[PDB]
């Protein structure tokens, strides 16, 4: 996944900043590029699958993880080792089939607050550490069924991925 699941983080943090009607990817300007590594397949639908479902379950656990991120109050010079401690615990409670979109919820709540602190430089660092963990402990264990592509199977049959072409009529 490497860069694909990293840009998955970037747009997911944008969706979190949308609480304010904002995106840090506006500053990055890469919403014009429209890259996001979607492969033009269905791996694009991953972010929307994790958006609808992940944020639905989140709401209760969102205020709960706001109380977690209240401890992880992002001050000038907060060591990411505090977050790494929460991510450590996260792995021990499970390999994170659903707790992995909750991993995006912790770092997402952090990135809302760190932009709110004008530590958007720490946001890009949080997206880096998240992407690191993703390709480090999660990536094989999830990639067996996509991890996130399971959510995609249930919400879309990749029927839209077939029709994504559309261009067969041009001949």
């Amino acid at each position: 996944m490497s860069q694909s699941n990293r840009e998955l983080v970037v747009d997911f943090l944008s969706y979190k900043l949308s609480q304010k009607g904002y995106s840090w990817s506006q500053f990055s300007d890469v919403e014009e590029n429209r890259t996001e590594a979607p492969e033009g397949t269905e791996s694009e639908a991953v972010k929307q699958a994790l958006r609808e479902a992940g944020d639905e379950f989140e709401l209760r656990y969102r205020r709960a993880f706001s109380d977690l991120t209240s401890q992880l109050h992002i001050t000038p010079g907060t060591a990411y080792q505090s977050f790494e401690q929460v991510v450590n615990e996260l792995f021990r409670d499970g390999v994170n089939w659903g707790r992995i979109v909750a991993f995006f919820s912790f770092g997402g709540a952090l990135c809302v607050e760190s932009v709110d602190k004008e530590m958007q430089v720490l946001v890009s660092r949080i997206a880096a550490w998240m992407a690191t963990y993703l390709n480090d402990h999660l990536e094989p264990w999830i990639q067996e069924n996509g991890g996130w592509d399971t959510f995609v199977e249930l919400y879309g049959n990749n029927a839209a991925a077939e029709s994504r072409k559309g261009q067969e009529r041009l001949e």
Partner: peptide
């Protein structure tokens, strides 16, 4: 069964 996609998913996924 419910079959409500997300609601059912997270209901069973919540207590791991």
């Amino acid at each position: 069964d419910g079959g409500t996609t997300f609601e059912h998913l997270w209901s069973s996924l919540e207590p791991d």
